Amino acid sequence: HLPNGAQIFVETSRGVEVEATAITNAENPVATVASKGDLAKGDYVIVTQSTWAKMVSRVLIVTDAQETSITLAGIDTSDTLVFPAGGTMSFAKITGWTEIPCVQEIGQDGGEQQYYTYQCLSDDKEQQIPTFKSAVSLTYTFAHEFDNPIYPILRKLDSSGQVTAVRMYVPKASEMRMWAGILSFNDIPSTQVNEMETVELAVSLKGDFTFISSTLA
């Protein structure tokens, strides 16, 4: 298993909102949407709002294109009791994607669980209570091509903060990952003699990673 050959894409445009009245809570979630509009098999959907704590901004996939009962399989399993019975959801389908020219470095900063420390007289050692998990950000570095159409799109997405979707596909394991976040795009290119010029892009997560097989497509 090697990461060679993987390529990363970003969202271009999204359609109008679609409302899901009811969601089943087991294995692959099922969304009961009346008169679905252009939701075939294999499309990608971004959840924009919900009342189920998780799954707020996580990208999912539609496997069944039924008229009234859309089954957004994806990865998330709602069988756990953490998600209560009553649940609402709103999602938008993605239209197209654009590929980053030449990624040469991927690095991630963040994570780690924060704790609250206390000690009473009875206690012999200091005790801790978990409080929350810090944020995670990634930086991508790619080559400089001022004619590349990705530059206006990145500039526009940076101008107005919006939770876009990012996809990257690894061919060796036929595995597909998806996440959503805000994009802040630097554009001043660092130049060094006898070395290619590079530009750097940063993403701040708003959800969790999704792992699927490429067979679903």
Q: Are 30 and 39 in contact (CB under 8 A)?
A: no
**Site residue total, a second copy (CB under 8 A):** 46
DSSP H helical ranges for the chain: 150-159
Task: Tell me: does residue 4 bind a second copy (CB under 8 A).
Answer: yes
- Residue number, 39 or 60, with CB nearest to a second copy: 60
Q: Show the site string, 7-46: x = touches a second copy by CB under 8 A, - = not.
A: ----------------------------------------
Q: Interface residues for a second copy in 112-131 (CB under 8 A)? A: 113, 124-126, 128, 130
Task: Tell me: does residue 163 bind a second copy (CB under 8 A).
Answer: no
Q: Pairing between strand 22-23 and 164-170?
A: unpaired
- Residue number, 12 or 184, with CB nearest to a second copy: 184
Task: Tell me: does residue 191 bind a second copy (CB under 8 A).
Answer: yes
Q: Are 9 and 167 in contact (CB under 8 A)?
A: yes
Alpha-carbon Rg for the chain in angstroms: 20
Min dist. Cβ of residue 193 to a second copy (A): 6
Q: Interface residues for a second copy in 78-117 (CB under 8 A)? A: 82, 104, 106-108, 111, 113
d(CA 31, CA 45): 12
Task: Tell me: does residue 136 bind a second copy (CB under 8 A).
Answer: yes
d(CA 65, CA 72): 9
Task: Tell me: does residue 186 bind a second copy (CB under 8 A).
Answer: yes
Provide the residue type at 31 as one letter. Answer: A
Min dist. Cβ of residue 151 to a second copy (A): 8
Tell me whether residue 111 is exposed, middle or buried, using C-beta atoms within 10 angstroms of its C-beta: 0 to 12, 13 to 18, 19 or more.
Answer: exposed
- Residue number, 86 or 107, with CB nearest to a second copy: 107
Could you tell me which residues come within 8 angstroms of residue 39 by beta carbon, excluding any fewer than 6 positions away?
Answer: 18, 33, 45, 62, 65, 70, 93
- Residue number, 66 or 139, with CB nearest to a second copy: 139
Min dist. Cβ of residue 213 to a second copy (A): 8
Q: Which residue among 37, 40, 96, 194 contacts a second copy (CB under 8 A)?
A: 194
d(CA 71, CA 41): 10
- Cα–Cα distances (Å) from 55 to 106, 112, 126, 133, 160, in that order, read 25, 21, 35, 17, 23
By CB under 8 A, name the binding residues for a second copy. Answer: 1-4, 6, 53, 82, 104, 106-108, 111, 113, 124-126, 128, 130, 132-136, 143-146, 159, 161, 173, 175, 184, 186-188, 190-197, 208-209, 211
